[PDB]
């Protein structure tokens, strides 16, 4: 009995850190902007598998971001936790979405990211000093990839870095949770911590975004205390986990393309372009594109009906050969313009330029301070996270010149 299905199981896991899962390359190859998939609980949904339809759909207000909707395309138990938990603005639609997002934008402006560059370099070179002095081998993840953006986002938010063991652990448990209870637990841990910080700030105003939200919006009744907790938690978790994942994966990927990595070292003006290429190619938040239709939507002769789930899969859309010639080839010299690693439209990544600055600084610093960096293990021995979470590795053994 043939087992071929026209709604394959989704998501799928990467077998190579920088290549689409076999299932996804297949989805990519099927003509038409949309394909049926079967989600973990048996329910069916659409995935968007082409670049222009991804942009169009991400821009269509008929696709809601409400993750508490009964028909939201839950991809794992994490989403069961999401569905019964309070929502940050990532799960809101206009006009509510804008009123919350605009409370946070001031920290992420181009001018502000510019003026973070000296601070990001200090943090990066700080953790490099320590790692290089500490041993001849290291886990790049715990010793460098994670602490750097952790310290940077903590200062932006006004979250004390002194508490980093606690909130880094809770962030991991939440984002990488495989069951709903573990996710709810990690969320509750972070929420109680952030609640304490809020009270503290009400007594003694504090620095950072959390400090400003407490002194301004909360005091005016413009945000709920619970919403402020959700907002700070989103930025705190996004701020840690995304750039950390890009760092480890970029290192693995560049070391597998030595000719391009050498070109990069020889001409640092190539770094911003290389960062855009690595973003396109690694697409680490590739299912952070879930939606539910609130009205019927016609998509090139296919119909998304009201109440149906839609996942905009940006890793697949980033490998659209009609936009990126030889899409599965890493090319730090290509134009990776218009890529969807950060989404598109009203929910386009708030932190995108912070992430870009961090990755530029990091790559330049590794090339400068540790040009002999190499993996301490074969790529094959690394353990990749599953396709239900942010892509990456939890451990990355590295070594360098003895
Ligand atoms: C390092 C690479 C990063 C990638 C690939 C990435 C990816 C994405 C994607 C695909 C979305 C769209 C979600 C959707 O449409 O539902 C998003 C939204 C978001 N990101 Fe990023 N992100 C990154 C870094 C960051 C950083 C460093 C922050 C710091 C706070 C951040 C904060 C956010 C927030 C708050 C949203 C929600 C935006 C909204 O709903 O209006 N991200 N991200």
XYZ file of C-alpha atoms and ligand atoms in Angstrom:
445
model
C 0.000 0.000 0.000
C 1.614 3.261 -1.073
C 2.224 5.718 1.764
C 2.602 8.777 -0.506
C 0.517 11.661 0.820
C -0.362 15.089 -0.523
C -0.271 16.596 2.974
C 3.213 15.645 4.272
C 4.083 15.952 7.972
C 5.267 19.507 8.783
C 7.685 20.730 10.158
C 10.691 18.555 9.249
C 14.166 18.550 10.808
C 17.360 19.707 9.147
C 19.981 17.010 8.557
C 22.498 19.691 7.428
C 22.571 22.980 9.433
C 22.517 25.135 6.307
C 20.416 23.067 3.926
C 16.615 22.657 3.685
C 15.164 19.459 5.137
C 14.591 16.976 2.286
C 10.818 17.470 2.791
C 11.201 21.242 2.412
C 13.230 21.038 -0.813
C 10.338 18.952 -2.131
C 7.780 21.553 -1.018
C 10.017 24.212 -2.635
C 9.993 22.256 -5.900
C 6.214 21.838 -6.197
C 4.684 24.538 -8.445
C 2.111 26.864 -6.926
C 2.406 29.232 -3.963
C 0.648 26.866 -1.487
C 0.848 23.282 -0.296
C -1.160 21.165 2.164
C 0.627 19.795 5.212
C -0.241 17.692 8.239
C 0.605 19.223 11.604
C 1.656 17.317 14.724
C -1.878 16.946 16.142
C -3.405 15.628 12.909
C -4.852 18.911 11.670
C -4.150 20.154 8.183
C -2.850 23.558 7.111
C -1.345 25.443 4.207
C 2.312 26.376 3.808
C 3.481 29.155 1.505
C 6.397 27.871 -0.550
C 7.293 30.738 -2.936
C 8.861 34.153 -2.422
C 6.377 36.642 -3.929
C 3.301 34.847 -2.524
C 5.003 34.850 0.885
C 5.387 38.688 0.733
C 1.819 39.159 -0.581
C 0.334 36.930 2.133
C 2.468 38.383 4.950
C 1.146 41.804 3.825
C -2.511 40.720 3.633
C -4.554 41.906 6.691
C -6.944 38.959 6.103
C -4.272 36.678 7.591
C -4.406 37.254 11.367
C -1.448 36.710 13.709
C -3.760 35.809 16.643
C -1.998 32.817 18.194
C -4.928 32.252 20.602
C -7.329 31.569 17.713
C -8.708 27.999 17.742
C -7.553 27.594 14.152
C -4.017 28.938 14.569
C -1.653 26.438 12.891
C 0.013 25.004 16.022
C 3.204 23.161 15.007
C 4.115 21.738 18.432
C 2.884 21.690 22.093
C 4.668 25.082 22.630
C 1.738 26.555 20.713
C -0.746 24.925 23.111
C 1.055 26.907 25.825
C 1.016 30.048 23.596
C -2.755 29.636 22.959
C -3.611 29.689 26.684
C -1.071 32.352 27.695
C -1.214 36.180 27.501
C 0.035 37.705 24.199
C 2.776 40.143 23.243
C 2.298 42.241 20.111
C 3.638 39.490 17.796
C 0.163 37.869 18.247
C -1.809 41.124 17.677
C -3.375 42.617 14.534
C -3.898 46.315 13.608
C -4.751 48.617 15.223
C -3.874 46.986 18.619
C -0.559 45.660 17.235
C 0.707 49.171 16.385
C -0.194 50.713 19.749
C 2.005 48.107 21.471
C 4.842 47.910 18.927
C 5.244 51.714 18.899
C 5.938 51.571 22.684
C 9.139 49.663 21.911
C 10.420 51.075 18.560
C 12.482 53.919 20.077
C 15.102 51.413 21.287
C 15.603 49.888 17.823
C 15.906 52.939 15.520
C 18.825 53.147 13.053
C 20.278 56.039 15.032
C 20.064 53.990 18.245
C 21.560 50.830 16.676
C 24.417 52.986 15.246
C 25.198 54.251 18.765
C 25.221 50.725 20.126
C 28.200 49.728 17.966
C 30.934 50.660 20.476
C 28.932 48.828 23.248
C 28.385 45.674 21.135
C 32.123 45.582 20.243
C 33.056 45.878 23.926
C 30.724 43.042 24.895
C 31.945 40.847 21.968
C 35.655 41.442 22.633
C 35.023 40.966 26.367
C 33.625 37.456 25.958
C 36.338 36.666 23.387
C 39.107 37.738 25.808
C 37.663 35.372 28.367
C 37.064 32.405 26.031
C 40.549 32.675 24.462
C 42.180 32.940 27.904
C 40.008 30.151 29.445
C 41.059 27.060 27.509
C 42.401 25.972 24.101
C 38.955 24.492 23.294
C 35.486 25.867 23.985
C 31.820 25.372 23.532
C 31.185 28.433 21.370
C 27.459 28.420 22.319
C 27.626 28.837 26.151
C 30.940 30.753 26.125
C 30.236 33.261 23.313
C 27.179 32.829 21.062
C 24.597 33.151 23.870
C 26.206 35.526 26.454
C 26.923 38.343 23.958
C 23.360 39.109 22.787
C 22.109 38.245 26.294
C 24.179 41.078 27.789
C 23.257 43.444 24.956
C 19.482 42.849 25.178
C 19.590 43.012 29.012
C 21.037 46.544 28.878
C 18.463 47.660 26.310
C 15.625 46.298 28.487
C 16.995 47.257 31.922
C 17.090 43.606 32.953
C 20.012 42.991 35.386
C 22.676 40.844 33.774
C 23.426 39.556 37.316
C 20.362 37.295 36.906
C 21.523 35.805 33.555
C 21.903 32.159 34.590
C 18.246 32.183 35.650
C 16.651 33.930 32.612
C 18.938 32.343 29.980
C 17.876 28.936 31.330
C 14.186 29.874 31.412
C 14.423 31.319 27.857
C 15.903 28.024 26.589
C 13.301 25.904 28.422
C 10.475 27.985 26.908
C 11.746 28.236 23.307
C 12.963 24.630 23.122
C 10.163 23.074 25.213
C 8.753 19.852 23.750
C 5.652 19.697 25.955
C 3.012 22.290 26.938
C 3.637 21.965 30.690
C 7.380 22.684 30.414
C 6.589 25.744 28.251
C 3.980 27.057 30.706
C 6.456 26.489 33.543
C 9.287 28.388 31.837
C 6.857 31.181 30.904
C 5.617 31.409 34.513
C 9.263 31.530 35.730
C 10.032 34.485 33.443
C 6.748 36.195 34.213
C 7.301 36.157 37.994
C 10.842 37.435 37.512
C 9.651 40.278 35.263
C 6.760 41.062 37.615
C 9.321 41.590 40.437
C 11.342 43.922 38.247
C 8.210 45.976 37.489
C 7.372 46.510 41.193
C 10.977 47.478 41.898
C 10.812 50.108 39.104
C 7.526 51.511 40.481
C 9.354 52.250 43.757
C 12.583 53.328 42.124
C 12.395 54.262 38.455
C 14.936 52.331 36.405
C 16.939 52.417 33.173
C 16.078 50.647 29.960
C 12.918 49.843 28.051
C 11.219 48.048 30.978
C 11.991 51.135 33.124
C 10.438 53.483 30.559
C 7.303 51.343 30.067
C 6.788 51.238 33.848
C 7.293 55.019 34.300
C 5.262 56.080 31.276
C 2.777 53.714 29.645
C 1.947 51.604 32.736
C 1.502 54.724 34.924
C -0.939 56.083 32.337
C -2.928 52.844 32.018
C -1.858 52.576 28.359
C -0.450 49.078 28.815
C -1.637 46.361 31.249
C 0.928 45.018 33.728
C 0.480 41.519 32.237
C 1.011 42.900 28.693
C 4.168 44.674 29.840
C 5.388 41.311 31.178
C 4.589 39.609 27.823
C 6.271 42.423 25.857
C 9.468 42.359 27.912
C 9.499 38.540 27.733
C 9.205 38.569 23.912
C 12.094 41.040 23.485
C 14.196 39.241 26.123
C 13.764 35.837 24.497
C 14.005 37.052 20.864
C 17.071 39.127 21.847
C 18.918 36.062 23.245
C 17.996 33.107 21.084
C 17.938 34.419 17.500
C 21.333 36.099 17.240
C 22.908 33.283 19.318
C 21.579 30.758 16.731
C 22.827 32.846 13.790
C 26.293 33.071 15.346
C 26.814 29.332 15.815
C 25.269 28.468 12.442
C 27.207 31.186 10.608
C 30.470 29.788 12.075
C 29.618 26.215 10.964
C 28.537 27.432 7.498
C 31.518 29.693 6.863
C 33.974 26.942 7.931
C 32.287 24.637 5.371
C 32.876 27.297 2.682
C 36.568 28.184 3.281
C 37.086 30.029 0.004
C 34.236 32.445 0.836
C 35.372 32.793 4.467
C 38.903 33.727 3.238
C 37.453 36.282 0.820
C 35.482 37.728 3.739
C 38.605 38.033 5.945
C 40.505 39.733 3.098
C 37.802 42.378 2.450
C 35.734 43.400 5.482
C 33.519 45.651 3.325
C 31.967 42.315 2.312
C 30.710 41.629 5.860
C 27.313 43.423 5.717
C 26.493 41.590 2.433
C 27.730 38.292 3.881
C 25.478 38.791 6.905
C 22.445 39.337 4.608
C 23.382 36.194 2.653
C 23.794 34.139 5.896
C 20.415 35.424 7.092
C 18.681 34.374 3.825
C 20.468 31.049 3.704
C 20.137 29.960 7.343
C 16.585 31.292 7.873
C 16.586 30.343 11.574
C 13.034 31.427 12.427
C 11.618 29.620 9.438
C 8.178 28.844 10.892
C 7.693 32.166 12.707
C 5.118 32.823 9.990
C 1.916 31.211 11.317
C -1.411 32.884 10.478
C -5.137 32.232 10.344
C -7.408 33.560 7.602
C -10.332 35.658 8.786
C -11.811 35.852 5.250
C -11.451 33.818 2.051
C -8.280 34.686 0.127
C -7.578 33.824 -3.541
C -3.939 32.858 -4.138
C -3.093 32.298 -7.817
C -6.102 30.051 -8.498
C -5.953 28.423 -5.044
C -8.339 29.409 -2.256
C -7.482 29.852 1.410
C -10.829 29.697 3.187
C -11.673 31.717 6.317
C -10.609 29.774 9.426
C -7.769 27.905 7.717
C -4.194 27.950 9.059
C -1.372 29.291 6.907
C 2.350 28.991 7.685
C 4.624 31.315 5.707
C 7.835 29.276 5.631
C 10.619 31.775 5.012
C 13.430 29.239 4.656
C 11.584 27.721 1.676
C 10.697 31.163 0.273
C 14.353 32.210 0.637
C 15.362 29.295 -1.605
C 13.110 30.513 -4.481
C 15.231 30.182 -7.594
C 13.101 32.761 -9.399
C 14.517 35.314 -6.968
C 17.931 33.875 -5.946
C 19.889 32.230 -8.800
C 21.135 28.807 -7.606
C 19.172 29.290 -4.347
C 20.835 26.454 -2.413
C 24.345 27.823 -3.008
C 25.914 30.061 -0.385
C 27.195 33.152 -2.117
C 28.377 35.997 0.134
C 28.648 38.152 -3.034
C 25.071 37.641 -4.280
C 22.325 40.177 -3.680
C 20.344 38.691 -0.835
C 18.017 41.755 -0.937
C 14.317 41.104 -0.321
C 14.905 37.953 1.713
C 12.268 36.932 4.269
C 14.404 35.742 7.227
C 12.918 38.678 9.200
C 9.385 38.355 7.702
C 7.679 41.213 5.845
C 5.048 43.886 6.524
C 3.673 45.012 9.854
C 5.278 42.237 11.952
C 8.657 42.483 10.205
C 11.360 41.774 12.783
C 11.650 44.638 15.292
C 15.246 43.690 16.158
C 16.513 43.126 12.619
C 19.064 45.921 12.633
C 20.343 45.044 16.119
C 20.810 41.480 14.843
C 22.626 42.816 11.735
C 25.000 44.979 13.816
C 25.679 42.122 16.253
C 26.495 39.654 13.473
C 28.787 42.153 11.687
C 30.692 42.913 14.890
C 30.916 39.182 15.780
C 32.223 37.993 12.408
C 34.779 40.807 12.247
C 35.915 40.011 15.805
C 36.296 36.277 15.149
C 38.308 36.987 11.969
C 40.456 39.499 13.868
C 41.006 37.699 17.166
C 40.674 34.031 16.209
C 41.526 33.517 12.504
C 42.566 29.918 13.277
C 39.121 29.014 14.711
C 37.924 25.544 13.593
C 35.375 22.993 14.745
C 36.727 20.487 17.279
C 34.347 17.843 15.884
C 33.099 16.841 12.391
C 29.917 18.659 11.221
C 28.270 15.203 11.240
C 28.675 14.828 15.020
C 26.778 18.061 15.792
C 23.232 17.802 17.103
C 20.776 20.044 15.248
C 17.635 21.362 16.913
C 14.339 20.075 15.416
C 12.207 22.064 12.953
C 9.666 22.914 15.672
C 11.971 25.476 17.278
C 14.483 28.225 16.295
C 17.144 26.527 14.142
C 20.620 25.944 15.530
C 22.866 23.831 17.733
C 22.881 23.739 21.540
C 26.584 22.891 21.658
C 29.459 23.794 19.290
C 32.934 22.412 20.172
C 35.594 24.645 18.739
C 39.323 24.998 18.986
C 42.073 27.203 17.590
C 45.888 27.763 17.533
C 47.870 26.027 20.313
C 19.012 37.237 14.625
C 18.115 37.000 13.677
C 16.579 37.181 13.827
C 15.696 36.588 13.013
C 16.055 35.646 11.844
C 14.360 36.985 13.399
C 13.182 36.583 12.793
C 11.939 37.165 12.937
C 10.752 36.919 12.130
C 10.679 35.963 10.915
C 9.759 37.669 12.624
C 8.311 37.779 12.075
C 7.320 37.000 12.932
C 5.937 37.014 12.325
O 5.740 37.563 11.205
O 5.001 36.477 12.985
C 10.270 38.393 13.773
C 9.566 39.253 14.582
C 10.025 39.851 15.743
N 11.334 39.915 16.188
Fe 12.970 39.047 15.198
N 14.472 37.837 14.484
C 15.818 38.007 14.770
C 16.313 38.801 15.786
C 15.579 39.540 16.700
C 16.128 40.311 17.789
C 17.635 40.417 18.104
C 15.109 40.870 18.457
C 15.256 41.783 19.700
C 14.211 42.191 20.423
C 13.876 40.490 17.790
C 12.582 40.850 18.132
C 11.429 40.601 17.402
C 10.123 41.064 17.785
C 9.760 41.864 19.043
C 9.192 40.553 16.693
C 7.679 40.760 16.569
C 7.482 41.915 15.590
C 6.014 42.253 15.505
O 5.216 41.336 15.763
O 5.624 43.408 15.153
N 14.202 39.687 16.728
N 11.598 38.064 13.927
